[PDB]
Design a protein around this motif. Structure first.
Motif, PDB file in Angstrom:
ATOM      1  N   UNK A  16      22.881  19.438 -91.829  1.00 17.94           N
ATOM      2  CA  UNK A  16      22.531  18.158 -92.274  1.00 17.94           C
ATOM      3  C   UNK A  16      21.783  17.907 -93.384  1.00 17.94           C
ATOM      4  N   UNK A  17      20.609  18.482 -93.689  1.00 15.91           N
ATOM      5  CA  UNK A  17      19.664  18.272 -94.922  1.00 15.91           C
ATOM      6  C   UNK A  17      20.414  18.819 -96.346  1.00 15.91           C
ATOM      7  N   UNK A  20      23.217  16.305 -97.385  1.00 13.78           N
ATOM      8  CA  UNK A  20      22.394  15.005 -97.469  1.00 13.78           C
ATOM      9  C   UNK A  20      23.241  14.042 -96.132  1.00 13.78           C
ATOM     10  N   UNK A  21      23.776  14.508 -95.126  1.00  9.39           N
ATOM     11  CA  UNK A  21      24.222  13.831 -94.141  1.00  9.39           C
ATOM     12  C   UNK A  21      25.543  13.172 -94.334  1.00  9.39           C
ATOM     13  N   UNK A  34      22.325   5.372 -87.451  1.00  6.99           N
ATOM     14  CA  UNK A  34      20.917   5.052 -87.661  1.00  6.99           C
ATOM     15  C   UNK A  34      20.484   3.793 -88.351  1.00  6.99           C
ATOM     16  N   UNK A  35      21.329   3.418 -89.382  1.00  3.52           N
ATOM     17  CA  UNK A  35      21.410   2.109 -90.283  1.00  3.52           C
ATOM     18  C   UNK A  35      21.671   1.157 -89.453  1.00  3.52           C
ATOM     19  N   UNK A  42      23.407  13.317 -83.378  1.00  5.32           N
ATOM     20  CA  UNK A  42      23.623  13.989 -84.261  1.00  5.32           C
ATOM     21  C   UNK A  42      24.831  15.122 -83.931  1.00  5.32           C
TER      22      UNK A  42
ATOM     23  N   UNK B   5      10.537  11.194 -84.489  1.00  2.00           N
ATOM     24  CA  UNK B   5      11.368  12.438 -84.997  1.00  2.00           C
ATOM     25  C   UNK B   5      12.661  12.117 -85.449  1.00  2.00           C
ATOM     26  N   UNK B   6      13.298  11.299 -84.994  1.00  6.07           N
ATOM     27  CA  UNK B   6      14.740  10.840 -85.519  1.00  6.07           C
ATOM     28  C   UNK B   6      14.461  10.463 -86.935  1.00  6.07           C
ATOM     29  N   UNK B   7      13.399   9.597 -87.287  1.00  5.01           N
ATOM     30  CA  UNK B   7      13.236   8.886 -88.541  1.00  5.01           C
ATOM     31  C   UNK B   7      12.906   9.972 -89.592  1.00  5.01           C
ATOM     32  N   UNK B   9      13.787  13.147 -89.240  1.00  8.24           N
ATOM     33  CA  UNK B   9      14.942  13.844 -89.609  1.00  8.24           C
ATOM     34  C   UNK B   9      16.185  13.141 -90.505  1.00  8.24           C
ATOM     35  N   UNK B  10      15.910  11.676 -90.379  1.00  2.48           N
ATOM     36  CA  UNK B  10      16.570  10.801 -91.474  1.00  2.48           C
ATOM     37  C   UNK B  10      16.278  11.047 -92.792  1.00  2.48           C
ATOM     38  N   UNK B  12      14.558  13.517 -94.192  1.00  2.00           N
ATOM     39  CA  UNK B  12      14.744  14.824 -94.565  1.00  2.00           C
ATOM     40  C   UNK B  12      16.202  14.869 -95.110  1.00  2.00           C
ATOM     41  N   UNK B  13      17.001  14.047 -94.299  1.00  2.00           N
ATOM     42  CA  UNK B  13      18.457  14.030 -94.445  1.00  2.00           C
ATOM     43  C   UNK B  13      18.974  13.470 -95.800  1.00  2.00           C
ATOM     44  N   UNK B  14      18.658  12.354 -95.871  1.00  2.00           N
ATOM     45  CA  UNK B  14      19.077  11.210 -97.145  1.00  2.00           C
ATOM     46  C   UNK B  14      18.477  11.766 -98.448  1.00  2.00           C
ATOM     47  N   UNK B  17      16.160  17.125 -98.725  1.00  2.00           N
ATOM     48  CA  UNK B  17      14.984  18.029 -98.690  1.00  2.00           C
ATOM     49  C   UNK B  17      14.527  18.400 -99.962  1.00  2.00           C
ATOM     50  N   UNK B  37      10.220  24.321 -93.942  1.00  2.00           N
ATOM     51  CA  UNK B  37      10.150  22.833 -94.420  1.00  2.00           C
ATOM     52  C   UNK B  37       8.615  22.359 -94.766  1.00  2.00           C
ATOM     53  N   UNK B  39       7.556  20.103 -97.081  1.00  2.00           N
ATOM     54  CA  UNK B  39       7.296  18.525 -97.497  1.00  2.00           C
ATOM     55  C   UNK B  39       6.761  17.905 -96.270  1.00  2.00           C
ATOM     56  N   UNK B  65       8.780   3.253 -88.907  1.00  2.00           N
ATOM     57  CA  UNK B  65      10.156   3.992 -89.022  1.00  2.00           C
ATOM     58  C   UNK B  65      10.811   3.334 -89.902  1.00  2.00           C
ATOM     59  N   UNK B  67      12.613   3.686 -93.279  1.00  2.00           N
ATOM     60  CA  UNK B  67      12.840   4.600 -94.219  1.00  2.00           C
ATOM     61  C   UNK B  67      12.706   3.824 -95.817  1.00  2.00           C
TER      62      UNK B  67
ATOM     63  N   UNK C  83       2.375  28.704 -93.555  1.00  2.00           N
ATOM     64  CA  UNK C  83       3.612  28.834 -92.807  1.00  2.00           C
ATOM     65  C   UNK C  83       4.431  30.335 -92.882  1.00  2.00           C
TER      66      UNK C  83
END
Ligand SMILES: Nc1nc2c(ncn2[C@@H]2O[C@@H]3COP(=O)(O)O[C@@H]4[C@H](O)[C@@H](COP(=O)(O)O[C@H]3[C@H]2O)O[C@H]4n2cnc3c(N)ncnc32)c(=O)[nH]1
Ligand SMILES: Nc1nc2c(ncn2[C@@H]2O[C@@H]3COP(=O)(O)O[C@@H]4[C@H](O)[C@@H](COP(=O)(O)O[C@H]3[C@H]2O)O[C@H]4n2cnc3c(N)ncnc32)c(=O)[nH]1
Ligand SMILES: Nc1nc2c(ncn2[C@@H]2O[C@@H]3COP(=O)(O)O[C@@H]4[C@H](O)[C@@H](COP(=O)(O)O[C@H]3[C@H]2O)O[C@H]4n2cnc3c(N)ncnc32)c(=O)[nH]1
Ligand SMILES: Nc1nc2c(ncn2[C@@H]2O[C@@H]3COP(=O)(O)O[C@@H]4[C@H](O)[C@@H](COP(=O)(O)O[C@H]3[C@H]2O)O[C@H]4n2cnc3c(N)ncnc32)c(=O)[nH]1
Ligand SMILES: [Zn+2]
Ligand SMILES: [Zn+2]
Ligand SMILES: [Zn+2]
Ligand SMILES: [Zn+2]
Lengths: 362, 369, 369, 362
Positions: A16-17, A20-21, A34-35, A42, B5-7, B9-10, B12-14, B17, B37, B39, B65, B67, C83
Motif C-alpha cells: 500500500x505505501x 500510494x494506495x 476512508x475519504x 484494507x 492507527x488507521x489514520x 496508515x493513510x 503513510x499510504x498517501x 512513505x 518505518x 518517519x 485524525x 489528514x 531501530x
DNA sequence: TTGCTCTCTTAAGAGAGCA
DNA sequence: TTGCTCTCTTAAGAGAGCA
C-alpha cells in the motif's frame, strides 16, 4: 482466476505505501472508504498479486496492488501468481510514484542577495527574509546564502573594467555554489536570486546569471517585502508605441514603474526617435507575482526583435522598471546573438539627469 | 487526542512513505540495509495551543485524525518546523502538504505511456551557466507516462577555447555528437532493447543541434522535449494552436540560395547579404517571432511539416548548396536536422552569429552527404 | 538517570555541533535561516537493558554522564540506530565515535599554516573513471595547516575522441592548461591577493602534467600534493627517507639525445630505440622502480634537485632537442615541467605510450621556447 | 589588556561549540577540568573576544575562544575589542574545525557486489552484509546497492566480445551511480566493491573499476565473511623467484592462496620459464585486512616492472590468489601503458587444466 | 538581572484482551 | 494463528526556587 495470493498485514502495509494506495492497472484511489468517513477494510478493497509468473517473485518490491475489478481480469494459477508477466508495467508504475515522492529534493537551492552599497544601508535585505520566501515555494537552501554588495566605483567611474569585475565577482560565487550537486540525480542546485540596486547594475546581474538554468527570481516589494503580493493576479498588457521614422538615434523607453517624460529623454539624447513599452497603469507595486516578470520578458523580446531589425545601430534604453524586471532584461540579452544596447540611467547626484552608464553588445 | 492507527496508515499510504518536505525515503535505511518505518506523523496545528503554530481557536479533538493537518516527515524536518514556527507557518506548511499529495495522486492516475532513453545535450558557448536539470526531463517524461531504466545520457560540449568557436571547437562538437553519444547508447543498449526511443532535449549551438538531429533521425525513434525560459521542461500550454508558418519564395537568379528562418526573432536581411553577397533569400517565419513560441509538441510537428514542404521545393531550384541563417528555438533546430537525414540529401551550409566577428553571420558546419 | 546539562554541553562542544554519523550541521536550519540546536545526545548502550544494544551487565547509573557512551546525532541517524541494533552494534558505534572525536581534536591542535588555492587537474584518457575528490585535497591541506577561501579549481580534460590522442586532443589539453586555468585564477584573483600559492594535485597525461608545471612554475608559488593508490591524498609516510636517484650519462655520438626517466617502472631500451633510432640514452632511475614511491613531499623535492643537476649537464652536450621517455608518478611530472620554466630553456620533445600504435612511444607535446 | 568583552550564556555556548572547546591561538583543550572530574567553570577557563577591532564584530561567527593566557597577550581597548585584527586566523581556525566535523559525509558510497552465476547460487553475498561492513568503516550508501552477476557464456565461449560486454555492463552501472554527486563539495561517491567469481572475471572487474578514484575493496572470508579478520595484522613478505634464462614463453606463477605445481604450468604451456611471487605460508585465509591487498599490489607491480622489461613478448599468468587480490591485479593494469598479459585459469569442467581464457593488452 | 530539579510535550513501540 | 487501548521509553523545552 483460480487461486489467490496470501499476504500478512506487514506485507500489505508495505505494498500500500509503495503504490500510494492506487490500483496499478486503472489508477483508482483505493482509499475512497476512508475519504468518505467509512472504515478502511484494507484486505477487501484491494488484492495483492505478484507481478511475475511463478526467487524474488514474493519480495515486496515484486508485489502489486490492484482493485478487485482489475484483479478479476488477471488469469492466475492455483497459487495466486499471474500467468502472464506484468513486471514491466509494475516497475514503471513504482518509478512514477518515486519520481513524484522525491520531488521535494528537486528544490535544493542557492540563496543569492545582491545590493548596491546604498540600498544595503537604507534597505538591507536579510537572508532570513529570502529563505522564508524560498521555503514557502519549496526551495531549500543547504548552506549559507550568498549576500553580495556591488563595489563602489573609483575615480574612473563604472567603465568597462568596473562592469567586467562585477560580472566576474558574481559568476565566481555562483559557479562555486553550482558545484554543490546533490539530490536524487546529481543535479546542480537551483538559484534563488533577489536584487536591489541601480538598474544598470541589476542588468549586469542578469547578464551574469542568464536564463538557461533552474533559476527563480524573487522581488522586494515595499508593502509585501520578499513575499509575492498576489499569486492569482493576471499580468498586465504591455502596450507598445513604435518609433517614428527618421535617422536620429533609436530610443527604447520602458514606462512600467512610472511614465518617463519624453523631454528628459531628448535632453540626454538629441534627435531621439522614441519607441515605448508601457503598461496601462504604471506603478511601483506592479510585480504582483513571478508570472509578471515572465510576461514582461516575453513582450519585451517580441518588440526587441522588431527594433533590432529596424537598424544596425545601437538601441538606447531609458527604463523606469522594477528591480526584478531589470534583472530579467539583462538575462534576456545573453544569447550568442548580441545587438548593441546603450543603457541610460538617472544620476541622482546630477539632478536625475539620464546618463549613459553601460554598454551591452558583441 | 492521539491519531489512531488507521489514520497513520493513510498518512503513510498517501505520501508513498517519503518526507513531504525533503523527499527522503522513510521506508528503508540505505546505510545498513534494513526495511524500517523511520518517519513521523506530524501535526501542522498542534494539540497544545502553546506549541508551535498553536492557536486558541483550534479544536484539537475535532482534528486528531484529519489528514489535512498531518504530514509524513523525517525526524529532522519535523524537529526543525517545531523549533521555528514563524519560519514554517501553518499556511505555508498546508500549501506544501497539499501540493505534495497532489503530485503523487497525479502520478498514480497517469497511465503507462512506454519507455524511452532520456537524452540531454547542452553546450558551453554561452557566457553564462547552461544546465538542463535531469529531474525536470524525467518529470516531463513521467507526465506523459514515459519511464526509463536509468537517468539516461547527459552530454555537455567542451567550451570554446581562446580562439572562440574555431575549427577545433567544431571538431569537438562533432566528436561529442557522433562518437561520445553513440558510445553511450551502445553501452546502454541491451537494457532498452533493439529500437529504444530517445526522449531528447537540447540547448546548444544551433548548428550542433542540427547535426544532432541528423544523426538521431531515422537511426532511432524520437520524442522531442523543450527547454522553456518560463516553464523549463514542462510544455507551456497543451491546448495552444500552432502558429502559421509563413513562407516567402526566393527571387529568380543565379545568386547563392539562402534559407532564412525567422521564428525566435526576425533575421535582418542586411546581415544575410553582408555574409553572402548576392543572396536570393527564401524565408520561413511566424507572424510574431518570439523566444517563447514552443508551447507544445504539436508546434514542433507543425514546423517540421511546413519545412519539409519548403525544403524539397528549394532543392529543386538548384544543385548548389543551401545556406541557412536561423533564429529558431533549440527544439526546432533538432527537428530541422532530422529532416536532412536520408530524404533531403542536399548540401546545407550552416551560418551562425559570430561573437569574434562583431555578431556577423559566418559559416560553421556543413550538413548533408 | 538523565544526562546532566554540563555533560550535554560537553557533547555539543567536543563534536562542534555536527552529527557524528553524517556530518550535518546541527546548530542552524539552512532552509528557513534560524540558529537552532536540533541534534540529540544519544546513548550507545541504552539505559533499559531491553533497548537497542541493551546488556544486562551495563550499569546505567555509572554511565549516564560518560561521554564515551554519548554521541551527538541528528534525529534521523538517531532514529535509525535505535531501530537496527544488529546493523549498528556497540563496537562499531564506539569506534566511529572515537574516530570522529579524534579528527576534531587534531584539527583544533593544528597550527595555522597559511592560505592556498586548491587546484585539481585530471584527464579522461584512461579507460576507467579518473576522479580526485575535492574533500581529500582540502583535508590534506588542512593537515598541514593550509586553508582556502573556497573549494578551489577543478579542471577535467575532455576525453580523447574517436581518433585517440590526436592533434585536436593535444590542442584541447593546451587550451585547458593555458586558457581555462588562467581564466579561473584571474576570476578568483582578488580574494587570494597578489601572489597566492597553488595547492596542486594532478592525475593526467604525463605530457600534460609537464605542460602544467611549466605554466605554473615561477608565475605562482606552489605546494605539490599527490594522488596515491593506497593512501589517496594523504602522504604515505612523513618519515620515509627519499631514495637515491641514480643517473647514467649518455654515450658520446651524434645521435639524438634521449632522457629516460625510470621511476614508476623500468622503461625498456628497445622501446626508446624503436621510436628514436640511434638514440643516445641518459637515464635517471631509482634502485627499485615502483608506482608507490611518492611517500612524502621530500621525495618530490629530491627528484627535482637530482634532475635540475642532470638537465643542465645534458643541455650542454648539444643544442638539438632532448627527447623525453618517462615512466614517472604524476606529481613528479608536474615538477619536471616546473624545472623547464625559465632556467632550462632548451627544447624538449615529449614521447608517450600510444594505445593507437600498440603501446609504442610516439611524440606528443613540444616544451620549451 | 584594558577592557573585557561581555557575553551572555547563550553566546558562550555557541562560541564553545563552533571552536570545539579549544583555544584558537594555542590549541589547548579547554575542557580539561571536565575530563578530570572537576566541575566546568566555562566563563573562567576561557575568554571570548571579537576577532576584529571595533557591524558584525559581535556576531557569534566573528567571536573567538581563547584561553586566559593567550587572551592576556592580546592588546584590547576599554571595550574588550582587539586593537589588531585576528579575523584571518579566526576564520581559518573555524574552517579547519568544519572540515573535520563534516568528514562523515565524505563517506557517501555506492555498494557493488559482483558474482559468477555459480557463486551466486552456492555462496550468495547479500547487500545487507556489504552494507554493515561498509557502515562500520564510515561508508554510507544512500540508495539501493548494485548487485551484478556475470552473464554465462554462449557457444563462442569467453571471447573478446564476451569480455567487452562484461566491461561495458560494469561501467554502465558504475557511471550512472557516480553521477550521484553530493556532500559538502559535490564529490562523486566512493565505490565499495566485493567480488566472488572466477579469477579472469575478477580481473575484468578490476579492469572496469580502475585504481584512480575513491574506491574501497571488501573481501569475502570463509570464517569472517565480509568483516576483516584482523585490522592490526601486518602484511606478509611477498617472495619472488626470477625466471630462468632462455627463449621459452615467460610465465608468472602467483602462489598466494596455495602452491601451484610447476608440472601443471608446463603441461598448459610447453617451455614455460617460471617466475613466481609467493608468500611464506600460502593460505586461503591470508586477506586479513585491506592493507594486505595494497601490499600485494605494491610487490606485484615492482616485479611486473622487472618482467615486462625482460621481453616484448606476452607474460603468461597462472594465479592461485584470493578474489580480492584478483580484482586489484586487474585494476593495476589500467594505465595508458599496456604490456600483453595472457591469463590462464583452471577449467573445473576439464579436470582443472590451466586454460588460456583472457588477454589484456594494447 | 545561570545562569539545577522536575514537570510537560510529542513522537514511537509493546503488549494485552479481544476480534 | 490484526490483526484497539494503554503503558512504556527516549529525547527535548519550560520554569521554579535558588545561586
Ligand atoms: N518615477 C520615475 N522613475 C524613473 C524615471 N526614469 C527612471 N526611473 C527609475 O525607475 C525606478 C522606479 O522605482 P522602482 O522602485 O519601481 O524600481 C527601482 C529600480 O528598479 C531600482 C533602483 O532604484 P532607482 O534608481 O530609484 O530607479 C527608479 C527610478 O530612478 O530598484 C528599484 N527600487 C528602488 N527602491 C525600491 C524599493 N524601496 N522597493 C523596491 N524596489 C525598489 C522616471 O521618469 N520616473
Ligand atoms: N534574437 C536573435 N537571435 C538570433 C538572431 N540570429 C541568430 N539568432 C540566434 O537564435 C537563437 C535565439 O535564441 P532562442 O533561445 O530562441 O534559441 C536558442 C538556440 O536554438 C540555441 C542556441 O542559442 P544561441 O546560439 O544563443 O542562438 C540564439 C541566437 O543567437 O539554444 C536556444 N536557447 C538559447 N538560450 C536559451 C534559453 N535560455 N532557453 C531556451 N532555449 C535557449 C537574430 O537576429 N536575433
Ligand atoms: N608501467 C609502465 N608505465 C610506463 C611505461 N612507459 C611509460 N609509462 C607510463 O608511466 C605511468 C606510470 O603510472 P603512474 O601511476 O606511476 O604515473 C601516472 C602518470 O604520472 C600519469 C598518467 O598515467 P599514464 O598515462 O597511465 O602513465 C603511466 C604509464 O603509461 O598519472 C599517473 N597515474 C596513473 N594512474 C594513477 C593512479 N591510479 N594513481 C596515481 N597516479 C596515477 C612503462 O614501460 N611501464
Ligand atoms: N589450491 C589451488 N588453487 C589454485 C591452483 N591454481 C589456481 N588456483 C585457484 O586459486 C583459487 C584459490 O581459492 P581462493 O578461495 O583463495 O580464491 C578464489 C578465487 O580468487 C576465486 C575463484 O575461485 P576458484 O576458481 O576456485 O580459484 C581458486 C583455485 O581454483 O574466488 C575465490 N574463492 C572461491 N571460493 C571462495 C570462498 N568460499 N570464499 C572466498 N573466496 C573464495 C592450485 O594449484 N591450487
Ligand atoms: Zn483497477
Ligand atoms: Zn525531511
Ligand atoms: Zn546524522
Ligand atoms: Zn591559548
Amino acid at each position: 482466476a483460480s487461486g489467490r495470493f496470501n499476504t500478512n498485514d506487514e506485507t500489505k502495509r508495505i505494498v500500500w505505501t509503495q503504490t500510494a494506495g492506487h490500483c496499478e492497472l486503472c489508477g483508482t484511489d483505493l482509499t475512497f472508504d476512508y475519504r468518505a468517513g467509512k472504515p478502511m477494510k484494507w484486505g477487501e478493497v484491494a488484492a495483492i498479486l505478484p507481478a511475475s509468473p511463478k526467487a524474488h517473485t514474493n519480495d515486496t518490491a515484486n508485489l502489486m496492488l490492484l482493485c478487485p475489478g482489475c484483479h478479476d481480469k488477471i488469469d492466475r494459477d492455483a497459487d495466486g501468481y499471474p500467468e502472464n508477466d506484468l513486471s514491466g508495467l509494475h516497475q514503471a508504475y513504482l518509478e512514477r510514484i518515486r519520481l513524484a515522492a522525491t520531488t521535494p529534493d528537486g528544490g535544493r537551492a542557492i540563496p543569492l542577495i545582491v545590493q548596491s552599497q546604498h540600498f544595503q544601508t537604507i534597505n538591507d535585505i536579510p537572508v532570513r527574509d529570502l529563505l522564508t520566501a524560498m521555503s514557502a515555494e519549496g526551495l531549500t537552501a543547504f548552506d549559507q546564502g550568498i549576500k553580495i554588495a556591488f563595489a563602489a566605483p573609483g575615480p574612473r567611474g563604472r567603465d568597462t573594467t568596473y562592469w567586467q569585475n562585477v560580472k566576474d565577482s558574481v559568476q565566481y560565487e555562483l559557479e562555486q555554489q553550482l558545484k554543490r550537486r546533490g539530490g536524487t540525480y546529481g543535479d546542480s542546485p537551483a538559484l534563488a536570486v533577489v536584487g536591489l540596486a541601480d538598474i544598470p547594475a541589476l542588468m549586469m546581474l542578469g547578464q551574469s546569471i542568464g536564463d538557461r538554468s533552474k533559476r527563480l527570481i524573487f522581488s522586494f516589494h515595499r508593502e509585501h517585502l520578499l513575499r509575492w503580493p498576489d499569486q492569482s493576479a493576471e499580468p498586465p498588457s504591455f502596450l507598445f508605441t513604435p518609433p517614428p521614422n527618421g535617422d536620429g538615434p533609436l530610443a527604447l523607453v520602458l514606462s512600467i514603474s512610472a511614465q518617463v517624460p519624453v523631454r528628459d529623454v531628448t535632453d540626454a539624447l538629441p534627435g531621439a526617435r522614441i519607441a515605448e513599452l508601457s503598461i496601462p497603469e504604471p506603478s511601483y507595486a506592479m510585480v504582483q507575482n513571478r508570472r509578471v516578470i515572465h510576461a514582461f520578458r516575453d513582450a519585451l523580446q517580441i518588440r526587441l526583435s522588431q527594433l533590432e531589425a529596424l537598424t544596425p545601430d545601437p538601441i538606447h534604453v531609458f527604463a523606469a522598471i522594477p528591480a526584478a524586471l531589470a534583472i530579467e532584461f539583462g538575462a534576456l540579452l545573453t544569447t550568442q546573438h548580441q545587438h548593441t544596447y546603450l543603457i541610460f540611467d538617472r544620476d541622482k547626484e546630477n539632478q536625475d539627469r539620464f546618463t549613459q552608464t553601460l554598454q551591452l553588445g558583441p
